[model samples]
Target: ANPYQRGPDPTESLLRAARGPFAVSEQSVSRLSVSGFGGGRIYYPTTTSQGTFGAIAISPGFTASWSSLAWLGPRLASHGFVVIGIETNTRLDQPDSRGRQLLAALDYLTQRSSVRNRVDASRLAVAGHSMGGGGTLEAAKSRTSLKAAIPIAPWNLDKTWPEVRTPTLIIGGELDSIAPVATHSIPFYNSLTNAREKAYLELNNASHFFPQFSNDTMAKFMISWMKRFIDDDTRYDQFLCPPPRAIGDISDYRDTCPHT
Candidate 1:
């Protein structure tokens, strides 16, 4: 007999799993005394993880809190990655401040034995939602420690992108307007110089917040993308690039962005 029903509330399943002797910590403090949403509060849900696992540092889009990546953090953590979703005080306007805040979180997370001891540290990754996407690039480019990067509907900081040595994967949506594929996504892809391991993706009929808010195909795409870059797992060979069902009106927007 099936002990759990098909839809017995995943929350209940989560609670049941909490029965183990594993440690779970939330609302941890940090030195990043920034003034953004969920600022001053960092959450880390740690556990005994797979050896050679890496840490994922997430940055949320402008006007978003670290909780924005809530869907992704636990999903990855459950599989054995130390995940940190950074909170930023600056929205879309202050890229410099946003970059600093994320770096601080990385510095803080890497210092902990729980994170450093469990994660490869050398295989670190940085990712973000919208403007947070741009911030991820800036943060990773400024610091050479990251192994991979994924910018979802990012705002481009082209001049700084060439400095990014980390393997980068850029995701975009054709229907996205806040940070259009035409304006930000394509340009950022072309400007990268440090590493040749770059991949650009666009989703059809998708917008800035589609899969991030839903558990549909778009979510599957982003999740698979992360696993490739952060986990370096080749098991998801099919998703390494856009699938046949993927649809989007894509054009190279690299020329649209000012080199400055």
Candidate 2:
């Protein structure tokens, strides 16, 4: 049976704040720290008494480093997931290379003695920005086990992703010229018809890097998506089902399900 098919909606407040920045009530975030791991840094979360948690590996865009994605690690880990922010060996690494590194980071989460006990080895996801966003899609294509993929303003030379079955969330900036919605994010979203679940979000007046920070709208959806899929928590269903109403800077939103 679907474990998430039944539960009290924990994300209700988040849905109510759909037009705002953050969802769930804010808590004093757990002490977060980072340490070198493989080609990146792993953001440690305050271990919970709730047993093992899901994991997410993140990649930065071309010429970007872990510092560029600094806001995500703690923000995501604070909500209850192990977040890994990866740095490429070189800033020029291709999206495919970034994708492989993301998978490697997940493998590290399972094999590292300290983190192995904290993560559900089977429940994992990938996220990235710009070229790294493209890397997120590439990671999903390379690894069938990923529960979710969230790519923000992703860019790629190759747009074909017919083999990706993992659920995906593609975020685009309507005014972004670097990774224009027309050629990159939109076509990529359209190509993932076979994905179990899919969503397209276009942020009005946002650039390629606007949504990468500590904004509440992005956090609300990211947390909700991770909780819904990676953690198999039904508390997030209501927000996805019927889809949250678009407000504020969110210009366009599309998804494959009314019940997802």
Candidate 3:
């Protein structure tokens, strides 16, 4: 059975709107270097002195670059997690290849660098947009180490994913033609019925980049989701239960085991 729980409050909204309570300044930012794994850029807090922290890795969608997912780095970093925004060797690489790179980036974090000693490599998560979202799923399938996954507006043309055991939270753009919900996100969520934990969130009349405009909303859930699973921090448990009252861009919500 799943061990995590969610609170019924609207606390996540706060996490979504700002730098969070663990806020850091530019001077506190850790120095990062390029990874030989896939040229991904890593972002971490200025101090590894706080002991081991959870880590997150992200990949951009098809034909996209680090600039596309740049927001994730600082947003996640400020919250005390090691964040990696990956870049593909070639922009055209498919989800499978992108998934491989996501793992490779995390593998870099396990090394003997300042960032490595600071991270709890065992507690990690992955996220992405579009094809990169698909890659997130692919990575979860191959790596049992992932504690959580957040796939936003994912697109996998072949529908090869039959099942996923990792806890998952899927976000979709209701009006996205590039990867339409009916054909992509919905189907993907449906197939993961056996996952340890899962949720499907559909945006209202939103397009592929919905999360960007509604980043506060996205951050609310995203940060809470990660904190609950990756860090095993029960502090976020209250935020996950009972779900949120219907409002804003999020039009549809489904969860396997949510508080009433």
Candidate 4:
């Protein structure tokens, strides 16, 4: 039996929907109450009867707040994860600072959060949008212990990331003039040379702000990547491998398949 597995067996339809099997709850945190990064909220499965869940720390883009990424909190929680959407020390914090904040949030989540008992300390992941996505890459590089990372339309002056050993799924925007897929996302994907597994997803007609809204395609793949790496759940491989063949709003897809 897979000790890390959570929620029901996944189907394409279920994966493509808005929510998952587990009931979720949110714990809004205060900046005064926490150390390290600015305070944010945590979403977790309320099903205490089930096994412990893995953890993930999500950061917002430069000049953005956690509210922009709030839509993902419950979506990932309902799918069986302890997800913390982190606010940076300041909205203007760069990707490098955002990355540090992401790590600090994970440390706080597993070590001292209210749902600490519900989390499996060893299993951790990170994610973010735009500059926050670049921070995702920063966290993975600094903390090789991270199981997975998903950086969405990330922006960074440092184009190469060969230091990251964590499995990564980079979601890019086809029409993003700010952080063009060819210049930013594709280069980042190509530089993940040390990643155990990696994939590049280019969303057709998408903007850098896609993650700001609730999106089914984004939610499904996010859950799948976290499941595959953080939970070590092979059942999710079906959604990952063959990679949907440019299904949904995606314009391009690339990965080192047969993930093992």
Candidate of highest TM-score: 4
Per-residue lDDT of candidate 2, residues 1-260 (tens digit): 54322223465463333232222112221113222323565555554454566889888899887788877776777566777777775788888888887887788667853667767788899999998899899999999889999998999987979989888889889899999999999999999978898888788788888755666767777777887888777667656766766778788889877534
Q: 1 or 2, which is superior by TM-score?
A: 2
Report the C-alpha lDDT of model 1 over 50-143, residue by residue, as the tens digit: 2445666777877776666676665545534567776665545455556666676666666653345555656677777887788778877788
Clashing pairs in 4: none
Candidate 1 stretches with Cα past 4 Å from truth are 1-27, 30-49, 90-93, 113-116, 157-160, 241-260
Q: What lDDT does each candidate get? A: 0.59, 0.75, 0.75, 0.91
- Encode model 3's per-residue lDDT on 162-211: one tens digit a residue: 46777889988789999898999998988886578888888778899775
- Write down the worst ten-residue block by lDDT for model 4: 239-248
* Preferred candidate (lDDT higher): 1 or 3: 3
Q: Candidate 1 — number of clashing residue pairs?
A: 2
List TM-scores for all candidates, in order: 0.72, 0.86, 0.86, 0.98
Clashing pairs in 2: 21-216, 21-217
Error of 2 at 154 (Å): 0.4
Q: What is the C-alpha RMSD of each candidate to the true structure, in Å?
A: 8.6, 5.0, 4.1, 0.9
Give the distance in Å from residue 117's predicted Cα in candidate 1 to where it truly belongs.
3.0
